[PDB]
Subunit: 188 residues, 3 copies
C-alpha cells in the first residue's frame, strides 16, 4: 500500500507552490502550507511535520518522522538534498542557559530565541535520528552521520559524525558526475 | 493550521483534571485519561503519547513525538518544566541484564521491572531526542542536553549532557527572576 | 483505552500469516502486509511502521515509533525478541560516501544500495532510540543499549552500547531457564 495524497488532494492543500510527482503522506502534518514551496520529484513520509516557512527543491526524500520547523526565517533544501528518518531541523530554538524562560506557553519578551535560516545545499544527506540547529548552512555535498547534532555551519564536501559533529573524512564528488548524467538522460 | 482539541472536546476526554488554555493535539495518543492531570497553559503536540499516571502543571510544552509512560507510579512535571521533541520518560522499564523475561507479552512473575515515580522539578528543560529512566528526580532548573540519557536523579541548577549524562556547567538562575516578573504582570 | 485492531479487522489486512493474541495499533502503518508474517502474542504500538518483508515470531513487543523497513531481503525476529521505542531497523540503505546518488526519487542505476537480511535471534532486546543497519545478525540473547547504532553482526549473549556499539559485559542467561519455566506453565 501507500499513504500518499492524490494530485486532487494535493491541490486542495494550498501550498505556496508544489511541483510534479510529489508524494506526501496523508499521515504527515503540514502546518501553514501557504508558506511551503516544494519542487518536483519529492517524497515526504509518514509522521513528518512540516511547519512554518519551508522550501524544498527537486529530487528530495524527507523520510518518516522528520520534523522541519521553519518558523519565520525558514528552512531551505536545494536539489538532491535528502533527510533520513527521525531528523529534526529547527530554524528557531530557546535558550537553554537559564537566562530566559522557554517555549510556546511564554510570551516573547521573556525568552531569548535564537533563529536564523537553515540551508541544506545540493547533495546534502542528513543521516537518521539527527538534529540541526538554527542559522546553519550545511555546505554542498556534506553528509552527516546517524545520530548527529549540528549546531554550526558545515564546510562543503565532508562527512561529519557525532554529538556535536566533527569532520571525519572527505565526501567524494562522483555524485556530481552522476547528477549531470541523470539529468542529461532526462533531456534526450 | 492547528491540530488541537477545542475546550469542548477536552472536557469530554475525561481527564482527572485539565486547566485553561490547554492545547492538545488531535494526533497525540492519550491512554487512561482518568489518571492524567494537566494544569493551565500547556501545549502537547502531534504524535505525543501520554499513557497512565501523568501530572503536568502550568506553563509547559510537551513537544511533538514525546512519550510519557507514567504507569501506576506516575510522572510528575512542576510548573515551567518543558520537554523537547522525541523524548521518552519511562516510569517502568524491564531488566536488560538477562536475569528476567521482558515486555508486555510476558507475565509479571517472570519479569523484573524497575519502577519508581519520575519528577521533573520547576524550570526543568529536557532537550530533544532524550530518554529519562524510572525513579529519578530531574532537579529544579536542570537542563538536560539533546540526545542524552538519564538513569539517576540530577542535582539542581546544572546542565548535563551525554549518554549517560554528566554535569558540564551551572544553569543560570535568571529564569527565577523572569518567572516572578512574568507572573506579576499576569 | 487502547488503539488496537480487533482480530476481526486483523484478518482484513492480509498478512502472509498472523497468529493469536496479536495487538496491532490502528496508528501503526503497515505496507505490503502480504509479505509480513506475525506469530502469537505480539504487540506493535502506535506510530510504528512495518514496510516490506518482515517476519516476527511469538512473545514479541515492537514498541511505539519503531520502524522496520524490511525491503525485499527482509527483517526476521525470532521468539522472545523485543524492540524498544523509536528504533529503526534497515534492510537496505544508500551509500553515503559520495560515490552514488541516493533515495527513492532517483533511479536505481545511479544508486549504490547496501542490502542484506537483518536477523534478531531469540531473546534479543534492542534498547530505545536505536538503529540497526543491513546485513546484521544480532546473536541469540544480545542486549543493545539505548541510543546505540549497530552496523555489524553481534556475538551471542553479550551486552553492547554506543555509536557504533562496543561490547561491555556478558548477558546473564537466567532467561533461558525462565523461558523453559514459563512455557511449561502452559
Ligand atoms: C533519505 C534517503 O532516503 C537515504 C536514507 O535514508 S539511507 C538510511 C539512513 N542511513 C543512515 O543514517 C546511515 C548513516 N551512516 C553512518 O552514520 C555511517 O557510520 C557513516 C557514513 C557516517 C560513516 O561510515 P564509514 O564511512 O563506513 O566510517 P566508519 O569507518 O564506520 O567510521 C569512521 C569513524 O566515525 C565513527 N562513526 C561512524 N559513524 C558514526 C556516527 N553515526 N556517529 C558517531 N560516530 C560515527 C567511527 O566510530 C569511526 O571513528 P574512529 O575513526 O575514531 O574509529
Ligand atoms: C520545549 C520547548 O519548546 C523548548 C525547545 O523545544 S527548544 C528545541 C530543543 N533544543 C535542544 O534540544 C537544544 C539542546 N542543546 C544542547 O544540547 C546544547 O549543546 C547544550 C545547551 C546542552 C550545551 O550548549 P553550550 O552551553 O553552548 O555548550 P557547548 O560549549 O556546545 O558544549 C559544552 C560541552 O558539552 C558537549 N555537548 C554539548 N551538547 C551536548 C550534547 N547535547 N550531548 C553530548 N555532549 C554535548 C560539548 O561537546 C562540550 O564538551 P567539551 O567541553 O568536552 O568539549
Ligand atoms: C520492548 C520491551 O517492552 C522492553 C522495553 O521497552 S524497556 C524500555 C527501554 N529500555 C532501554 O532502552 C534500556 C536501555 N538500557 C541501557 O542502555 C543500559 O544503560 C544498559 C542495560 C545497556 C547498561 O546498564 P548497566 O548494565 O546497568 O551498565 P552501566 O553500569 O549503567 O554502564 C556500563 C558502561 O556502559 C556505559 N553505558 C551504559 N548504557 C549506555 C548506552 N545506552 N550508551 C552508551 N553507553 C552506555 C556506561 O557509561 C558505562 O561505561 P564505562 O564502563 O565506560 O563507565
Ligand atoms: C515509509 C513509508 C512507505 N510508504 C509506502 C510507499 C512505499 O513505496 C512503500 C515501501 O516504502 P519504503 O519502506 O520506504 O521502501 P522503498 O521506498 O525503498 O521501496 O510503502 C508510505 O506510504 N509511507 C511511508 O511513510
Ligand atoms: C508542531 C505542531 C504545530 N502545530 C500548530 C500549532 C502551532 O501554533 C503551529 C506552528 O507550531 P510550531 O511549528 O511548533 O512553531 P511555533 O511554536 O512557533 O508556533 O502549528 C500543531 O498543531 N501541532 C504540532 O505538533
Ligand atoms: C504505548 C501504547 C499504549 N496503548 C494502550 C494499551 C496498553 O494496554 C495501555 C498501557 O500501555 P503502556 O503505557 O505501554 O504500558 P503497559 O506495559 O502497562 O501496557 O495503553 C496503546 O493502545 N498503544 C500504544 O502505543
Ligand atoms: Cl520519533
Amino acid at each position: 500500500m501507500n499513504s500518499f495524497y492524490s494530485q486532487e488532494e494535493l491541490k486542495k492543500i494550498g501550498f505556496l507552490s508544489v511541483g510534479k510527482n510529489v508524494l506526501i503522506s496523508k499521515k504527515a502534518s503540514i502546518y501553514n502550507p501557504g508558506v511551503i514551496s516544494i519542487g518536483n520529484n519529492v517524497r515526504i513520509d509518514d509522521f513528518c511535520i512540516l511547519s512554518g516557512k519551508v522550501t524544498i527543491g527537486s529530487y528530495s526524500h524527507i523520510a518518516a518522522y522528520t520534523a522541519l520547523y521553519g518558523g519565520e526565517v525558514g528552512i531551505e533544501m536545494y536539489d538532491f538534498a535528502n533527510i533520513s528518518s527521525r531528523t529534526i531541523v529547527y530554524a528557531a530554538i530557546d535558550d537553554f542557559s537559564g537566562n530566559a524562560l522557554m517555549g510556546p506557553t511564554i510570551p516573547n519578551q521573556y525568552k531569548n530565541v535564537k533563529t536564523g535560516k537553515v540551508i541544506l545545499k545540493k547533495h546534502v544527506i542528513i543521516g537518521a535520528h539527527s538534529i540541526i540547529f538554527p542559522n546553519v548552512v550545511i555546505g554542498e555535498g556534506v553528509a552527516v552521520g546517524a545520530m548527529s547534532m549540528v549546531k554550526e555551519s558545515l564546510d562543503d564536501w565532508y562527512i561529519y559524525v557525532g554529538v556535536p559533529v566533527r569532520k571525519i573524512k572527505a565526501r567524494k564528488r562522483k555524485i556530481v558526475e552522476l547528477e549531470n548524467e541523470f539529468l542529461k538522460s532526462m533531456n534526450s
